[PDB]
Symmetry: C3
Subunit: 416 residues, 3 copies
């Protein structure tokens, strides 16, 4: 038992040791800023490794999942997945707005058009490391390219390419085999990185509990943390199991239990795209879900799901707006929540989406950007919980989509 799953127990022990080391160093030592930065180097190296493997994995896996489906049945499955994700996103948005209004812890047109612009990039190679942005200037619109991987356009192109090569028949079989092999190789490289994972995680946690200086941020942010945690808990325990039970007449909690390893891996590494191998294995072997449904549904959810964004980034934006004593109407609150939810779409995949996404959402909404440092402190913990919620939602969606496509999966088998 210990040898079979030594990675998970070693990671848990590393987390505990990192928390203890961070507390002890903070209490019994006086480190300068430079030494505090040098103390977290292994965690930065681990994050660089994790970011290095996101692109090829997502691209190859998405293409493989699209091409594995028959041409005449892929539309209905995609429609079901889209409907499920839309319903979950809407419910999450409503819950987040209601909670942020009740607890009170405290141009959007260009930002909405930039999403469509980034859906269709002007260069395929440039989209791998750069993104497009526009702003008003004296009024005319001026656009430019800045650093940051454009995963939305890559996803769209991957979907189109997979659909095209899955219909060519024998003319596209070489591409199908090439991308299948590439996906397998990337999955093995991810497994290789998972061996170095725990040592980086230890220093990441130790250095996270070190940068806190005054500790009064915990006093000021108590209600904001309570709001985000309550929203995530309600979404995880009430809404998703009920939807699964409504569609699938089976015990939702047994299904959630069967994905415990994937959930804990997502909670530890704080990334959904890099948890894909564990998610695949748990869904296929523990829950007896069809491979064809899983390999197509999970890659889309690992990059598109926005149930946690609407419950974290939108709540943070509303909290920041409330901090400045700004008077907000019921229409304005909805505007901010939708803008924040839509602005960040690849947050689940990023190992620390919050650090880069907070300033992007604040700039898109048009609020003072100097208040980001107040909320960055608890991002390392709220973001990891959000990652667990997103992975659980993706697994539930995979199960639901498998349940609904019963005749399609039996017609797809008689053909072969």
């Amino acid at each position: 038992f210990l040898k079979n799953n030594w990675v998970l127990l070693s990671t848990v022990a590393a987390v505990v040791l990192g928390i203890t080391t961070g507390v002890l160093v903070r209490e019994h030592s006086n480190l300068s800023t430079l030494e505090k930065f040098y103390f977290a180097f292994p965690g930065e190296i681990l994050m660089r490794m994790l970011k290095l493997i996101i692109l090829p994995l997502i691209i190859s896996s998405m293409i493989t999942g699209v091409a594995a489906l028959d041409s005449n049945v892929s539309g209905k499955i995609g429609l079901r997945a889209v409907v499920y994700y839309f319903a979950t996103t809407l419910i999450a948005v409503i819950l987040g707005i209601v909670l942020v209004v009740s607890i009170k812890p405290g141009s959007t047109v260009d930002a909405m058009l930039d999403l469509i612009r980034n859906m269709f990039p002007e260069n395929l190679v440039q989209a791998a490391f750069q993104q497009y942005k526009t702003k008003r200037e004296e009024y005319k619109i001026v656009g430019m390219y800045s650093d940051g991987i454009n995963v939305l356009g890559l996803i769209v192109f991957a979907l189109v390419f997979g659909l095209v090569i899955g219909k060519m028949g024998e003319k596209g079989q070489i591409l199908v085999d090439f991308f299948n092999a590439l996906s397998d190789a990337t999955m093995k490289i991810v497994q290789i990185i998972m061996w170095y994972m725990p040592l980086g995680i230890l220093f990441l946690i130790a250095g996270c509990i070190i940068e806190v200086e005054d500790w009064e941020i915990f006093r000021k942010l108590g209600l904001y943390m309570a709001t985000v945690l309550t929203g995530l808990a309600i979404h995880s325990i009430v809404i998703l199991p009920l939807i699964y039970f409504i569609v699938v007449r089976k015990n939702p909690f047994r299904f959630a239990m069967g994905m415990a390893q994937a959930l804990l891996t997502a909670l530890m590494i704080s990334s959904s795209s890099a948890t894909l191998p564990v998610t695949f294995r748990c869904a296929e072997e523990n829950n007896q879900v069809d491979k064809r449904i899983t390999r197509f549904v999970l890659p889309v959810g690992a990059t598109i799901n926005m149930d946690g964004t609407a419950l974290y980034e939108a709540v943070a934006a509303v909290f920041i707006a409330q901090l400045n004593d700004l008077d907000l109407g019921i229409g304005q609150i909805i505007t901010i929540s939708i803008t924040a939810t839509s602005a960040s779409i690849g947050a689940a995949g990023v190992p620390q989406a919050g650090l880069v996404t907070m300033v992007i959402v604040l700039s898109a909404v048009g609020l003072p950007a100097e208040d980001v440092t107040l909320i960055i402190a608890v991002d390392c913990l709220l973001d990891r919980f959000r990652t667990m919620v997103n992975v659980l939602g993706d697994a539930f969606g995979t199960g639901i989509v498998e349940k609904l496509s019963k005749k399609e999966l039996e017609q797809m088998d008689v053909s072969s």
Copy 2:
């Protein structure tokens, strides 16, 4: 009939409706600059889609066309194509100079060396989205990289790679199959984009006839438009059919008629590289031209042909020079015409080459860049006609090259 070719009639109807809508909005409405920009968003989205597909299509198609030819016969075919293109370019240059001198509508060394520098880029990945440029500075030469796809170096590398892998025999067959499948997939994605084409075209035309403000630009630019249109018409109707009849003893106008769909598609979408599927189909099925000659000749012409550049951009440069009352000798006029013709080489492929190429040519020649906005107004129409002329020239060249290589195409068949 209507169902078979619904795309072309729908595109024509969209063009008519866009012209009517633009005229009506300009006459009966007062729109601000921001609203005028927001009115043309679908056209911008269509242009982004068109630009997204240029790179893979050109690269894969060019490699496939080079590799499909036998190693011992590819030299003569390439030589014939080069000679044809050189002759047509020289005739176009002479005609443009003569017309611009007669009607009078009104350092180059670094620019010429930059063409050779861009023929051999220092990085293959960087060449996909960046270009090299040099300038004098106090005198020493300083070079840097700026945005803009370097299609010249990509073409050169594609030619070399295709020639190399077409001679390896069975060792390069996997690469040949891979690039064949990639070319087919890109062609299907282009066909997919052609469905959204008409809706974007409507708003593009409607927003083009909207940005005109004073309407006195039509009074000032009457002679410049007349000169460009007369040059293009003379090249299309007199010179190219005569050359085709001289080499090929067949009716030139029947050959031109058989490519009407491709000509209209080029006139509508204002891009030659994206018209490649229609050109291939019309040349192979309507004119009974050999596939091996077509798949090699057309990709080169869609990126290298300069008969329309010498008749449009050179005429515009000479017009700008005449506007400033600059005294130009017969040597100077030739210098400007050759510099403008050589500076722009990938204009035919770009959906709106004129917008970006005008400032590049003006900077290369060394003339005031503030006069570009005067001529940008009628670019959307002169450029579309230029695109029709270029496509017709490419088709005529394909026919001529097929005619000349008669023994090579019969020796290439006895081998297989």
Copy 3:
């Protein structure tokens, strides 16, 4: 005989003619700076061609060499190669320090951490043309990306990818075949460039002996050149042959003689990565070295070897430090030598590594950067000798590693 090896004799004649032309032009002509720059254009074009082919060649060849080895024997061979390179680098460092101290011709933490940071880039596409760098700022650390290919991370990823796909069995065979064909194609393109090589070399040499103005740099740099040349000569003639004779009980000088063509090609083109085809051919056919050992050892040495860096760049750094009359302890001299040796790792592959590496090492050490122009003058000659020394060291290492892995190469054959 003349027809078989016309390239080498033509290159030697071009070198002689270039030296004569440069001397004659310098003595009997007065050229301005702009004309001196325009005189060396063919050499710049040749260097652009050479830089264009480095990336695909190195990546494909390294992957192919890793994947060709059996999974159970690749570790010992890699360990032997690493030990050999470490021993040679240490001996070179010691010799360089001793010589620079005896003859006297006259923060590092961030630079050392940047090496590990660049070992694991955050983006695979961006690593092809950009590098990461950090600096202190008021103290916090700020990082950014600048131009320059990150070959270290590409090498690491190539090693991991080759190891992963060589164990997949039949699931990764398509990738193995693809990269084998790509390596062959790149090797043929290199052979094509070798035809234009001599004409560019002539003008490169002619323009190198032209930029010298005062000729007093030869008087001031006499001892620095003597030190570097003596170190390189001692390393080439004494240490490496002795190590080869100790491990391999065969005549070291016959082995060196059998690689004369590769040595002369490295001396002429001043690049190790582009000399790889000649090195492969000479090692496999003239010295009867196993192909499996050669195709794996040589690509690693052509990018990682640091015996010449420690003998050239470290000596130059110590000379610059001595020029400023800076008092340096025995610990400081070691610090500078190790920092300079470790900072430059891909110098052997670059056609003119010295030009870009001198300022990088000077910035990393923290010394006045205005003294680089004094030592740039003789870089074109010291660098070419360094390239010969590095190629000889790589060949000797290939021989030694082949000798040590005797049972592994006989067990790897009984399996097939």
